[PDB]
Amino acid sequence: YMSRYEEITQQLIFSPKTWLITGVAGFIGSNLLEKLLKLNQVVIGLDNFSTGHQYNLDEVKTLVSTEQWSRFCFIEGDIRDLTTCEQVMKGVDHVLHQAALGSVPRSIVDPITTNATNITGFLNILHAAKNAQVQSFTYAASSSTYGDHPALPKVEENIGNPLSPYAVTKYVNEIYAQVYARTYGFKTIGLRYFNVFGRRQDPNGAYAAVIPKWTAAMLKGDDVYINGDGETSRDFCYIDNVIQMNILSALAKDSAKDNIYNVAVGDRTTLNELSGYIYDELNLIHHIKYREFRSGDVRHSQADVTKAIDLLKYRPNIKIREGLRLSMPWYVRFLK
């Protein structure tokens, strides 16, 4: 049971609001779309099909009522263009900002474009929302902002030095968010995601994330590469926690805003152990090389989510095993 969360969703189903999801055709944004439409919300969506997909929107349309779908106004556009940002704010209540170019290697090779989308694009949305005078503003931040801090698990007040352009942009989101509270009194909630996985995470690409990259390879029968000695660990977080954490935040009490919160489960799984779980779970539906680490790669990563639990009444109900199990079917359909 996710109790506060249940309570919040009930409220919404009755007094429906207008939401704006940027990066709505992406993995996390499309997940949020699914959930919000099922709660009969009015949604305005923004994506520029950089890393997002029209097919992700399509799939969502097959998962929801057609009266539910009628409430979605999709917009093909760029958060990089301030004018778009403003047209799309009209009448919005809650903002869920997910639009950004992710990935550490990507920023390392083209920082200019990453900067433009993640900082210029972020500030645009943030400003537009301030002026539109929305009721809440929740944005995607990154566990990467911890950088070289050696503490495990990671606690929000203690970050170190950023180790890549990507980490910087995300840190810069937070800093801007704070200054906006100081100078306009406009209160946000930033979520430091930690390695989210689940349905509709792109397994194709040079920047494919690990769980969907391995899963696709274990099916095609291709090699499975482990970038390093295979001891690196992470706090893998199923989408349903992230979806939960977004809603808790959009409707959070004012004293909880202007805050940064880790979004994860509190556990730690190794690149070796993961390969275990991904296989065990895939052969229950009937179907390993080593290399160097990456430049900018992180050694150990585990979150402390007590802040979330405390102030927002968060409930990480789905740990990694179950999460993989709820996921693999989606990748079979998608990979046939």
Ligand X SMILES: NC(=O)c1ccc[n+]([C@@H]2O[C@H](COP(=O)([O-])OP(=O)(O)OC[C@H]3O[C@@H](n4cnc5c(N)ncnc54)[C@H](O)[C@@H]3O)[C@@H](O)[C@H]2O)c1
Q: Which residues are at the interface with a second copy (CB under 8 A)?
A: 82, 108, 111-112, 115-116, 119-120, 123-124, 127, 161-165, 167-168, 171-172, 175-176, 178-179, 182-183, 295-296
Q: Mask 125-164, x = binds ligand X (CB under 6 A)?
A: ---------------x-x----------------------
Do the beta carbons of residue 173 and residue 185 sit within 8 Å?
A: no
Minimum CB distance to ligand X, residue 20 (Å) = 12
CB of 153 to ligand X, least distance (A): 17
Is 166 among the annotated ligand-binding positions?
yes
Q: State which of residues 5, 21, 26, 176 lies at the interface with ligand X (CB under 6 A).
A: 26
Kindly state the smallest distance separating residue 79's Cβ from ligand X, in Å: 4
Does residue 323 bind ligand X (CB under 6 A)? no
Residues 106, 167: Cα–Cα separation, whole Å: 11
98 binds, among a second copy, ligand X, none (CB under 5 to 8 A by kind): ligand X
Contact 27, 200 (CB under 8 A): yes
Q: CA 303, CA 310: separation in Å to the nearest integer?
A: 15
Phi, psi of 277 (to 5 degrees): -55, -40
Nearer to a second copy, 50 or 306 (CB): 50
For residue 28, the partner it binds in a second copy, ligand X, none, with Cβ less than 5 to 8 A by kind, is: ligand X
Judged by beta carbon, residue 28 or residue 311, the one nearer ligand X is: 28
According to CB under 6 A, which one of 37, 64, 100, 305 is a site residue for ligand X? 100
Q: Which stretch binds ligand X (CB under 6 A): 8-16, 44-52, 174-182, 300-308?
A: 44-52
23 annotated as ligand-binding: yes
- The region, left, alpha or beta by phi > 0 then psi within -120 to 50, assigned to residue 91 is left
For residue 311, the Cα-to-chain-centroid distance in whole angstroms is 20
> From the centroid of its chain, how far is CA 187?
20
Q: Which of 48, 114, 164, 246 binds ligand X (CB under 6 A)?
A: 48
Nearer to a second copy, 109 or 285 (CB): 109
Q: What is the residue whose two structure tokens read 């792109």? A: 202
From the list a second copy, ligand X, none, pick the one residue 176 interacts with, judged by a Cβ distance below 5 to 8 Å according to partner type: a second copy
Binding status of residue 212 toward ligand X by CB under 6 A = no
What's at 87, amino acid-wise? Answer: Q
CB 224 to a second copy: min, Å = 28
Q: Is 313 in the site for ligand X (CB under 6 A)?
A: no
Using CB under 6 A, which of 12, 95, 96, 101 touches ligand X? 101
131 alpha carbon, distance to own chain's centre: 25
List the single partner that 257 binds among a second copy, ligand X, none, CB under 5 to 8 Å by kind.
none
Site residues (vs ligand X, CB under 6 A)? 22-23, 25-29, 46-52, 78-80, 98-102, 117, 121, 140, 142, 193, 195-196
